[PDB]
Write a protein that binds this ligand. Structure first.
Ligand SMILES: *[C@H](C)[C@H]1/C(=C/c2[nH]c(/C=C3N=C(/C=C4\NC(=O)C(CC)=C4C)C(C)=C\3CCC(=O)O)c(CCC(=O)O)c2C)NC(=O)[C@@H]1C
Ligand SMILES: *[C@H](C)[C@H]1/C(=C/c2[nH]c(/C=C3N=C(/C=C4\NC(=O)C(CC)=C4C)C(C)=C\3CCC(=O)O)c(CCC(=O)O)c2C)NC(=O)[C@@H]1C
Ligand SMILES: *[C@H](C)[C@H]1/C(=C/c2[nH]c(/C=C3N=C(/C=C4\NC(=O)C(CC)=C4C)C(C)=C\3CCC(=O)O)c(CCC(=O)O)c2C)NC(=O)[C@@H]1C
Ligand SMILES: *[C@H](C)[C@H]1/C(=C/c2[nH]c(/C=C3N=C(/C=C4\NC(=O)C(CC)=C4C)C(C)=C\3CCC(=O)O)c(CCC(=O)O)c2C)NC(=O)[C@@H]1C
Ligand SMILES: *[C@H](C)[C@H]1/C(=C/c2[nH]c(/C=C3N=C(/C=C4\NC(=O)C(CC)=C4C)C(C)=C\3CCC(=O)O)c(CCC(=O)O)c2C)NC(=O)[C@@H]1C
Lengths: 206, 273
C-alpha cells in the first residue's frame, strides 16, 4: 500500500481541521492573542465566509478586551447577531439552519434525527435566541471549549458517544479549506445532509 | 469585578455571579490532567435573569459552588464618597458647656459609637447623659459607658463573632480600621481571660486614644487619611468597613453580622505570631 501517515487526511482535504488547533484567550492577553482569537471566532462561526470591515462588531470586541465578557459570551453575541442571522438563518430552512449552527458552534454535524426534533420545537416554543442559547448552554459546548476557548471542529476525530456516520456527514458540510457556506450562491442555501441518512441512525418515536 | 452594563439589550436585570471554578467547568487545552487557570479560582460572570437558573445549576452540578450572587445595579456602583469622613469634623466638649453644646456632643457620640445605627428614645441612656453636663464624667468616660451598655453588646457583640466585633470596635472607638491579624488575635485572647469589660477598656485605655481625641473630644474617623504606623492596606480596608453615609452596622439585616474584612486581607498586611 505504502500510504503515508498524513495521506488519508490530505486525500480528503481535511488536513487543517483534523486535529484542529485550539485557540484560548488567557487571563492577561497580548494585543496579538486577542486578535488571533477574534480572527478564529469569526472564521469558525461564520463558516469561512468573508466578513468585511463594516461587518465586524466593535463593541463585543471591546468588552472582550476589557475582560468584561469571556470568549463563550463573545460567541453568543456573534451567534445572536444580525450578520449571522442574515447568512445562516433567514434565507435557509430550519432544517438547514440547525445543521449549520451545529457545525459552527460544535464542529460535528448532527448525530441523529432527534437532534432536529428538540431544536425545531425549541424554536417554535421560544425564540431564535433561546435556541441559539441551548447550544452554547448545552453541556457538550461546556465540556469542550467551555470557556475562554474558541469553538473548533470536533468532527473527523473519534469523540466519545459519537454516532457512526458523523464522519461522512461532516465531510458533506466541510468540503475543503476554500469552501464556505454562503447565503449568496446560485441556487441559494440548501441542506447538504440528506434526510434519509439521518433516519439511518436510530429514529425513536419523537 | 466591574460590570459594564446594568441591563441586557433585551430587557433583563443582569446579575453578577461568583463561583469557585472547577477543572470540569473550564480547562486548558493541553495534554495531561485538566487544570483551570490559577488566576481564576474565583471566577465571575454576569448573566441575565433568564439564564441565571440554568447557569447556576450547571455550576453546581459540576464541582462548582456559588460564592455569591449580587444584582449588577448594586455592583458597578461608585465606591463610597469619603467627603464627610476625609475631614471628620470633630467635637470638643468644653468645661462649662452650654445646654446645647452638651446635646451636640451626645448626638455625635451616639452616631460614631453606634454606627449609623438608630438609637430609639427608650434605648438612649438618661443616667450617663445626666452625668455629663453637671461634670463628673469626661467625654472619654461617657464613651466607655456606651461600650459597656447592653445596647452596644446586643448590636455588635452578641450577634457577630469576636473577630468581627473586634474590627467593629476598632472603627467605633478609633476611626482606623484594624491593621494585621496580630491585633485581632490579641483582642480575642484578652476577651477570653479578662472578659468583655477589659476588652472595651483596652481601646479607650490605649495610647492611640488620648494621643488622638484624648479626653473630651468625641472620637472621629482617623482612617481615610494617612496615619502613623498604618499599613496601606488598612486604607483599603476602611473602604470595606465603611460603606457610605446611610450605611450602618446592623444586626437587623439578613445574616446581619458578617465580616467586612476578609481574613486573607488582614494576613496580607502582616502574617506572623
Ligand atoms: C477576483 C480576482 C475575481 C473574483 C473573486 C471573487 N471571489 C468571491 C467570493 C468568494 N471568494 C472566496 C474564496 C475564498 N475563500 C478563501 O478562504 C480563499 C482562500 C483559501 C478563497 C480564495 C469565497 C469563500 C467567497 C465567498 C465570500 C463570502 O461569502 O463572503 C467573489 C464575490 C462573489 C460573491 O457573490 O460573493 C468574487 C468576485 N471574481 C471576479 O469577478 C474576479 C475576476
Ligand atoms: C483496526 C482493527 C483497523 C484499523 C482501524 C483504523 N481506524 C482509523 C481511523 C478511524 N477510525 C474511526 C472509526 C470510528 N469512528 C466511529 O464513530 C467509530 C464507532 C462508531 C469508529 C470505530 C475514525 C472516526 C477514524 C478517523 C479519526 C480518528 O483517528 O479517530 C485508522 C487510522 C486511519 C487514519 O488515517 O485516520 C485505523 C488504522 N485499520 C487497520 O489497519 C485495522 C485493520
Ligand atoms: C505538588 C508539588 C504539591 C501540590 C500540588 C497540587 N496541586 C493541586 C491542585 C491544583 N494545583 C493547581 C495548579 C496550577 N494550575 C495551573 O493552571 C497552574 C499553572 C498555570 C498551576 C501551577 C491547580 C489550579 C489545581 C486545582 C485544579 C486543577 O486540578 O488544576 C493539588 C490537588 C488539589 C486537590 O485537592 O484537588 C495538589 C496536590 N500539593 C501537594 O500535595 C504538593 C505539596
Ligand atoms: C484546635 C482544635 C485546632 C486549631 C486552632 C487554632 N486556631 C488558631 C488561631 C485562631 N483561631 C481563631 C478563631 C476564632 N475567631 C473568633 O472570633 C473565634 C471565636 C468565635 C475563634 C475561635 C482566630 C481569630 C485565630 C487567630 C490567632 C488567635 O490565636 O486568635 C490557631 C493558631 C494558628 C494561627 O494563628 O495561625 C490554632 C492552632 N488549629 C489546629 O491546628 C487545631 C486542630
Ligand atoms: C419607610 C418609608 C420604609 C422602610 C424603612 C425602613 N428602614 C429601616 C432601617 C433602616 N433605615 C435606614 C435608613 C437610613 N440610614 C441613614 O443614615 C439614612 C440617611 C442618612 C437613611 C434613610 C437605616 C440606617 C436603617 C438601619 C438601622 C435601623 O434600625 O433602622 C427599617 C427597619 C429594618 C429592620 O429590619 O429593622 C425600615 C422598615 N421600610 C418600610 O416598611 C417602608 C417601605
Amino acid at each position: 500500500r505504502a500510504t503515508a501517515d498524513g495521506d488519508a487526511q490530505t486525500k480528503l482535504g481535511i488536513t487543517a481541521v483534523a486535529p484542529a488547533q485550539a485557540v484560548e484567550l488567557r487571563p492577561n492577553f497580548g494585543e496579538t492573542e486577542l486578535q488571533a482569537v477574534i480572527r478564529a471566532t469569526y472564521k469558525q462561526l461564520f463558516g469561512n465566509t468573508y466578513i468585511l470591515e463594516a461587518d465586524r462588531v466593535v463593541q463585543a470586541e471591546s468588552l472582550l478586551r476589557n475582560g468584561s465578557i469571556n470568549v463563550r459570551e463573545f460567541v453568543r453575541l456573534l451567534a445572536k447577531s444580525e450578520l449571522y442571522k442574515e447568512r445562516f438563518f433567514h434565507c435557509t430552512s430550519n432544517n438547514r439552519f440547525i445543521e449549520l449552527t451545529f457545525k459552527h458552534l460544535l464542529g460535528r454535524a448532527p448525530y441523529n434525527q432527534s437532534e432536529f426534533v428538540e431544536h425545531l420545537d425549541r424554536y417554535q416554543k421560544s425564540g431564535y435566541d433561546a435556541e441559539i442559547d441551548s447550544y452554547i448552554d448545552s453541556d457538550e459546548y461546556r465540556r469542550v471549549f467551555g470557556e475562554n476557548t474558541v469553538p473548533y471542529f470536533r468532527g473527523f476525530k473519534y469523540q466519545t458517544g459519537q454516532a457512526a456516520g458523523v464522519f461522512e456527514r461532516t465531510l458533506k458540510l466541510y468540503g475543503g479549506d476554500a469552501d464556505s457556506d454562503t447565503n449568496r450562491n446560485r441556487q441559494g442555501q440548501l441542506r447538504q445532509v440528506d434526510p434519509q441518512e439521518l433516519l439511518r441512525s436510530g429514529r425513536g418515536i419523537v | 469585578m466591574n460590570v459594564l452594563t446594568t441591563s441586557s439589550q433585551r430587557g433583563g436585570k443582569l446579575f453578577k455571579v461568583t463561583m469557585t471554578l472547577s477543572p470540569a467547568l473550564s480547562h486548558h487545552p493541553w495534554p495531561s490532567l485538566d487544570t483551570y487557570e490559577p488566576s481564576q479560582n474565583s471566577y465571575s460572570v454576569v448573566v441575565p435573569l433568564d439564564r441565571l437558573l440554568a447557569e447556576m445549576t450547571y455550576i453546581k452540578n459540576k464541582g462548582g459552588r456559588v460564592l455569591d450572587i449580587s444584582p449588577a445595579d448594586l455592583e458597578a456602583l461608585g465606591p463610597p464618597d469619603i467627603s464627610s469622613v476625609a475631614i471628620p469634623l470633630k467635637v470638643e466638649l468644653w468645661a462649662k458647656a452650654d445646654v446645647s453644646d452638651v446635646q451636640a456632643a451626645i448626638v455625635a457620640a451616639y452616631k460614631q459609637i453606634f454606627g449609623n445605627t438608630y438609637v430609639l428614645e427608650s434605648e438612649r441612656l438618661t443616667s450617663a447623659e445626666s452625668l455629663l453636663r453637671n461634670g463628673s464624667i469626661s467625654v472619654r468616660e461617657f464613651v466607655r459607658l456606651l461600650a459597656k451598655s447592653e445596647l452596644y453588646k446586643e448590636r455588635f457583640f452578641f450577634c457577630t463573632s469576636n473577630n468581627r466585633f473586634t474590627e467593629l470596635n476598632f472603627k467605633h472607638f478609633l476611626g482606623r480600621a484594624p491593621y494585621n491579624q496580630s491585633e485581632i488575635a490579641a483582642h480575642l485572647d484578652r476577651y477570653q481571660t479578662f472578659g468583655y469589660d477589659a476588652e472595651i477598656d483596652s481601646y479607650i485605655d490605649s495610647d492611640e486614644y488620648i494621643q488622638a481625641f484624648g479626653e473630651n473630644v468625641v472620637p472621629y474617623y482617623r482612617g481615610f487619611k494617612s496615619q502613623s504606623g498604618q499599613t496601606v492596606e488598612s486604607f483599603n480596608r476602611m473602604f470595606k468597613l465603611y460603606r457610605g453615609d446611610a450605611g450602618s452596622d446592623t444586626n437587623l439585616n439578613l445574616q446581619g453580622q458578617k465580616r467586612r474584612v476578609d481574613p486573607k486581607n488582614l494576613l496580607r498586611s502582616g502574617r506572623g505570631i
